[PDB]
């Protein structure tokens, strides 16, 4: 009956690089998703103690949120842009896992997923 | 202090009518919002003594909640749909009044209002 620690966002032993793709994910993708009207329930880890949701972290064993993604990009925690896209995908599917098809929170995450996909269509070439 | 009696939900001395719009407000509007994941703080009158909110009914002098709106629709309390729509608006603006921009409860209210407005956009045509 206690929230887990948030996901790690710093990995100081890992090599670091800046790519056009990683910079785009932070400066465009994360930015556009953050300001969407549906974003706030996904911006921080679910606070299951505050919400009185004792089952959340019994069901969700790989939590992910947009605040954690932002910090990872800022700390060059990702070497490959797909590791970041995976975290985004984990955040959406965590919503589909915890809730039920057609739920309103799920319709919210679905709309955010469509926008995320629209944005990564414009991802700069890996070059 | 103490809680007030909840809003009245019955008016025997008022004429009654069933209309396309009132039926929609109960079976579609109220139903949809009730089943929203963000609905639980608005389904019943604020128990300001149980929530440790002694100032709530000093600030909020026209309280309104979805359980009251549900009963009013079931008891034909409303002759026009705008009476019911006004109770919804009161419930949302009460939340904005008592709390502050950016609070969790306010963001929940705003999401319900946006869904409410979409469902009202599809109110059947007036007889």
Curated annotation (Swiss-Prot), chains A, B:
List the expressing tissues: Ubiquitously expressed.
| Stated name of the protein | Bromodomain-containing protein 4
Q: Where is this cross-link: Glycyl lysine isopeptide (Lys-Gly) (interchain with G-Cter in SUMO2)?
A: 58
Q: What is known of its domains?
A: The NET domain mediates interaction with a number of chromatin proteins involved in transcription regulation (NSD3, JMJD6, CHD4, GLTSCR1 and ATAD5). The C-terminal (CTD) region mediates interaction and recruitment of CDK9 and CCNT1 subunits of the P-TEFb complex. It is also required for maintenance of higher-order chromatin structure.
**Annotated family:** Belongs to the BET family.
Question: What's its job?
Answer: Chromatin reader protein that recognizes and binds acetylated histones and plays a key role in transmission of epigenetic memory across cell divisions and transcription regulation. Remains associated with acetylated chromatin throughout the entire cell cycle and provides epigenetic memory for postmitotic G1 gene transcription by preserving acetylated chromatin status and maintaining high-order chromatin structure. During interphase, plays a key role in regulating the transcription of signal-inducible genes by associating with the P-TEFb complex and recruiting it to promoters.
Q: Which domain of life is it from?
A: Eukaryota
List each copy of the Bromo domain by range: 17-123
Organism lineage reads as:
Eukaryota, Metazoa, Chordata, Craniata, Vertebrata
Its PTM note reads: Phosphorylation by CK2 disrupt the intramolecular binding between the bromo domain 2 and the NPS region and promotes binding between the NPS and the BID regions, leading to activate the protein and promote binding to acetylated histones. In absence of phosphorylation, BRD4 does not localize to p53/TP53 target gene promoters, phosphorylation promoting recruitment to p53/TP53 target promoters.
Query: Whose protein is this, by species?
Result: Homo sapiens (Human)
- Disease affiliated with this protein: Cornelia de Lange syndrome 6: A form of Cornelia de Lange syndrome, a clinically heterogeneous developmental disorder associated with malformations affecting multiple systems. It is characterized by facial dysmorphisms, abnormal hands and feet, growth delay, cognitive retardation, hirsutism, gastroesophageal dysfunction and cardiac, ophthalmologic and genitourinary anomalies. CDLS6 inheritance is autosomal dominant. A chromosomal aberration involving BRD4 is found in a rare, aggressive, and lethal carcinoma arising in midline organs of young people. Translocation t(15;19)(q14;p13) with NUTM1 which produces a BRD4-NUTM1 fusion protein.
Description of how the protein assembles with itself and partners: Interacts with p53/TP53; the interaction is direct. Interacts (via CTD region) with CDK9 and CCNT1, acting as an associated component of P-TEFb complex. Interacts with RELA (when acetylated at 'Lys-310'). Interacts (via NET domain) with NSD3, CHD4, BICRA and ATAD5. The interaction with BICRA bridges BRD4 to the GBAF complex. Interacts (via NET domain) with JMJD6 (via JmjC and N-terminal domains); the interaction is stronger in presence of ssRNA and recruits JMJD6 on distal enhancers. Interacts with NSD3. Interacts with NIPBL. (Microbial infection) Interacts with bovine papillomavirus type 1 regulatory protein E2. This interactions may serve for the tethering of viral genomes to host mitotic chromosomes allowing successful partitioning of the viral genome during cell division.
Q: What else is known?
A: JQ1, a thieno-triazolo-1,4-diazepine derivative, and I-BET, a benzodiazepine derivative, have been tested on tumors with success. Treatment with GSK1210151A (I-BET151, a I-BET derivative) has strong effets on mixed lineage leukemia and promotes myeloid differentiation and leukemia stem-cell depletion.
Localized where? Nucleus; Chromosome
């Amino acid at each position: 009956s206690m929230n887990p620690p948030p996901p790690e966002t710093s990995n100081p032993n890992k090599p670091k690089r800046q790519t056009n793709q990683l910079q785009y994910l932070l400066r465009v993708v994360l930015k556009t998703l953050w300001k969407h009207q549906f974003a706030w329930p996904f911006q921080q880890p679910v606070d299951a103690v505050k919400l009185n949701l004792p089952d959340y972290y019994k069901i969700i064993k790989t939590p992910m949120d947009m605040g954690t993604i932002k910090k990872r990009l800022e700390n060059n925690y990702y070497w490959n842009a797909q590791e970041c896209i995976q975290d985004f995908n984990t955040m959406f599917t965590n919503c589909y896992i915890y809730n039920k098809p057609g739920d309103d929170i799920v319709l919210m995450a679905e709309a955010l997923e469509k926008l995320f996909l629209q944005k990564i269509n414009e991802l700069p070439t890996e070059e």
